[PDB]
Design a protein around this nucleic acid. Structure first.
Lengths: 351, 256, 254, 254
DNA sequence: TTAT
DNA sequence: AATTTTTAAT
DNA sequence: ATTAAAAATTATAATTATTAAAAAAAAA
DNA sequence: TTTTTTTTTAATAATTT
């Protein structure tokens, strides 16, 4: 994604970062980009040395990982909506050209890994070959329809349409691993939404309105900071990174006066400098209408998971049937309101 | 510069065992008229209002309005070092980067100096108004520690109802249903084992019992707890410390 | 309309603290004569015979013979909510499977109504035609409760041997050899903490000690436990509850 | 061939609760003049010297320089199988590698014959020399149980500073900084509360706390503990074990 | 045909 | 996604 | 020299079942 | 306040397949 926006935010505006808890939300709905969840549960959760599969051939590690993560999110009151990526735009195909060669570099490296056969290097090198096709999501969107949790197929980009969902107020947060949801304009971005109860990875919240207050910008120029920070659509300027782009945007505001107020010998402008096309894509992408779809919360069924996942994916009978029962005991109860609905913040106090 | 000598130092010991399981990091609003803590939980549910007044302390002096961001888990590890009879003096001088706890033992002469590394917190304070509550229940404090521990075995939600001649701590769960009724006993001469219910309209709410189990760790301070409810107004679990002030626990209800 | 007001609430509470780790679920064979429970453990080794007669309850009545299925883990946590000085009334309903437990301290005003959800397992009861035994070892229960706690650190098996001088809880193991040669005292003073052994025939049986740790959880009921055994019959771990029936446990030997 | 009958059993019991966490495997160099032990811990940092003299035992009948190998976890399990007022009689045999322990109740007739399976290990003669000590700090033992537990919440480094007016225990860490200062109270009439320091050379050096916390598990053995140390000498955390010898704990500084 |  | 050493500029 | 940025190098985990301590509840 | 006991936790590979 963006080269070090999170490190820049943590080293410039630490008041826009709130390390929260898993139980800290409790009724506020989030919008999971499900693609990083699917890659996390195909890369981390393995059987040892390879993918984890049944004897029919296809893999199902992402189904159980996203199953227990989804049940643990609704145990803590968090109501997910899973937004899946659709056909990507043509500006992303430069990054997909970089992702094609970086996948194929590990394809040639798998020939070198399989000669030695050492499991510290076989399992490390085969994690880079994880590819999500249509059947990796057609067998995965069917599971969330059994819960009654809405799944959303974005027409262009799931990072873009998560940020439009927070913008309309239909969802509270976009729980997304990359920093692109700040660029299309979600006022709340969540990070590391993990089912673990420990504080080895605290859950970190990006308030974009606290970023734009601290930086003194708005949405149309924080996009312009992302272009100099090396976004996936177009490359950045070769001499400007994190620390050289905060002061440059705060001196010369728009992207059209970055180029005209620069010496091109020290900082060479690249030939694929499509800043104006990516500025149109970041502000107004072709996302689905958030008012067109409603986040329905239907009752989950237990008997249909037996014929779909206990038989076909041959899982444990005493864990899926325990999983629906621990889902329905955390669903029918009332939603605990937050304290900010009753009391208002009067004095900002600091140490 | 700031010196807060407390002869009954187990009062300040029993405060921080009641906040180490709820508040990870708090800002102590040290005024010249007392010691204040208004730190809402990181789960965005429960406020803790602590008021240690200046007249309750033995030798209290203060100059500026301090704000010490204190890891309260790290405070309860330090405050577990003193016993139940030690004279506890807090100290924080100018450019207050640290808080010096002095646990002066009164008879065995174990002068325990404890210098705490503080933390940087920007904790927002919440504006609490002065309103009249509907059903004010003045329970025994150890009875309320029993009741929240009892109904947490059944389910995670208590249903507190105020009848005309009693209060009902209803609960339900997978184990079944549990109703605990407490009729008023204002005719009893001692106020330690008396339930006094101040009624003008009946009210029925629903509160989470995970935060109420955190609230009943302040029961070694007072022998009498006060619960204050109204319609869509948070529960005020108040532990009035004798001649020192109050430890008010606010709690947002569950709304259907 | 089953209704059993029990004035000494620690009697029912200490029963459920003993069956919460050994009996998963059982049928309370509640009749007009009294509360009965013939059960068997979840590992299908030990047998539990709990009898609570109607004379110990204050007001007891039964319209019919009620045999409901109560989860012993869920009833023990609900009886953990009762006080040690509480008065326990069991207002079960014939029409709906709900066992309503009412707790009320007599010095206090705390009326604690507790209702349960009931899974009627309908397990057929196991009845044993009990007979005379070889040695009836009436021995102090809280001192017996540490005896199986001592020998469980050594091994998982004990050999109980009734002899002329007294019993001998000899237990071997990979950590060492442990023999507790408890001679018979039979002093006429302090009968609640004395040892009384009856003598018929020489006894040598090897038991399992993992379930004898479970059997000593009922030791806050009675001060005296009976260890009554014979040659090839399971032992009766009889806890004589005061002015009621008895809670007996059984263990088939190794 | 060796019988060591002891009147009260808590003297041997509180030794083994102090030694189960620190020492996993050592040899008991039992001599004719008493019971000695010159162990060293499993991490090879802290050296433990124990002495139980022959005059403090009620009946001592040692005949040879016995050095058996005892698993200290297996001994402390069997020492958990005893009351706090029991009569402990150790026994050993020449051909069998078995250390026998007979536990007699004083008011009851519970004879608890326990036998230990022993093993051969590396019999190490560490041989520490006796030498002078610059700062001898006698303090209450429950006070030393507090201070090692109090400073363990901060970090794992205690400096011990000597003065004629008192002794300072200071610890520091990422959580904060601690400084516990005692005082040489010479006006206390009892000896279990007074702190007595005999110092000529002041000394301040850093000690670990993971081994000082295991040293404070010997605090029920006696009410007084004496801390003797110097500039490069390891600290002697010396207990008394009533009037039966001493328990020396050595800790090398950081 | 599509994650950082 | 973060590190991390190496290469480069103020 | 510090600062800074682009070559390269490594990462995406969660449930039950124990488990070995570690403070809490009942009663010391 | 402090012993011993049971209840949570932070443990750590161990599958989960």
């Amino acid at each position: 994604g963006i080269q070090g926006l999170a490190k820049l935010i943590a080293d410039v505006a630490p008041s826009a970062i709130r390390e929260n808890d898993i139980k800290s939300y409790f009724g506020r709905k989030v919008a999971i980009d499900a693609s990083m969840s699917i890659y996390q549960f195909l890369i981390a959760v393995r059987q040892g040395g390879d993918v984890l599969q049944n004897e029919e051939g296809e893999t199902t590690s992402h189904l159980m990982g996203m199953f227990y993560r989804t049940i643990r999110m609704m145990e803590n009151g968090i109501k997910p909506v899973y937004v899946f990526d659709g056909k990507p735009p043509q500006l992303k195909s430069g990054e997909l050209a970089k992702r094609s060669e970086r996948r194929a570099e590990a394809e040639k490296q798998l020939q070198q890994a399989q000669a030695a056969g050492a499991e510290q290097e076989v399992e490390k090198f085969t994690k880079r070959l994880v590819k999500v096709t249509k059947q990796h999501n057609d067998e995965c969107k069917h599971l969330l329809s059994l819960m009654g949790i809405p799944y959303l197929d974005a027409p262009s980009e799931a990072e873009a349409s998560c940020a439009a969902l927070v913008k309309a107020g239909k969802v509270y947060a976009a729980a997304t691993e990359d920093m692109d949801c700040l660029t299309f304009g979600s006022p709340v971005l969540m990070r590391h939404l993990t089912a673990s109860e420990a504080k080895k990875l605290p859950i970190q919240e990006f308030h974009l309105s606290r970023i734009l207050q601290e930086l003194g910008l708005n949405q149309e120029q924080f996009v312009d900071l992302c272009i100099l920070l090396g976004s996936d659509y177009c490359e950045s300027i070769r001499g400007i990174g994190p620390k050289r782009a905060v002061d440059l945007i705060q001196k010369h505001k728009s992207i059209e006066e970055i180029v005209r107020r620069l010496d091109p010998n020290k900082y060479p402008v690249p030939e694929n400098w499509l800043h104006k096309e990516a500025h149109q894509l970041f502000l107004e992408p072709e996302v689905l209408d958030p008012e067109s779809v409603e986040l329905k919360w239907s009752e989950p069924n237990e008997e249909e998971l037996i014929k779909f996942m206990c038989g076909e994916k041959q899982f444990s009978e005493e864990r899926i049937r325990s999983g629906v029962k621990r889902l329905s005991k955390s669903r029918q109860g009332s939603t605990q309101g937050r304290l900010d609905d009753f009391f208002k913040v009067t004095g900002s106090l600091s140490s | 510069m700031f010196e807060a000598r407390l002869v009954q130092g187990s009062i300040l010991k029993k405060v921080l065992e009641a906040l180490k399981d709820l508040i990870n990091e708090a800002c102590w609003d040290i005024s010249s008229s007392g010691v204040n803590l208004q730190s809402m939980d990181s789960s965005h549910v429960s406020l803790v209002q602590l008021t240690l007044r200046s007249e309750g302390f033995d030798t209290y002096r203060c100059d500026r309005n301090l704000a010490m961001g204190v890891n309260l888990t790290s405070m309860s590890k330090i405050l577990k070092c003193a016993g139940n009879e030690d004279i506890i003096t807090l100290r924080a001088e100018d450019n207050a980067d640290t808080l010096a706890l002095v646990f002066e033992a009164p008879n065995q002469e174990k002068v325990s100096d404890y210098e705490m590394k503080l933390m940087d917190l920007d904790v927002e304070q919440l504006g609490i108004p002065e309103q009249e509550y509907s059903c004010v229940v003045k329970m025994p404090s150890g009875e309320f520690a029993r009741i929240c521990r009892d109904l947490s075995h059944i389910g995670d939600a208590v249903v507190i109802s105020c009848a005309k001649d009693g209060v009902k701590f209803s609960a339900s769960g997978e184990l079944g249903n549990g109703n605990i009724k407490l009729s008023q006993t204002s005719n009893v001469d001692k106020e330690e084992e008396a339930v006094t219910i101040e009624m003008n309209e009946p009210v029925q709410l629903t509160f989470a019992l995970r935060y109420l189990n955190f609230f009943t760790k302040a029961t070694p301070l007072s022998s009498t707890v006060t619960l204050s409810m109204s319609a869509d107004v948070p529960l005020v679990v108040e532990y009035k410390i004798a001649d020192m002030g109050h430890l008010k626990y606010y709690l947002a209800p569950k709304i259907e």
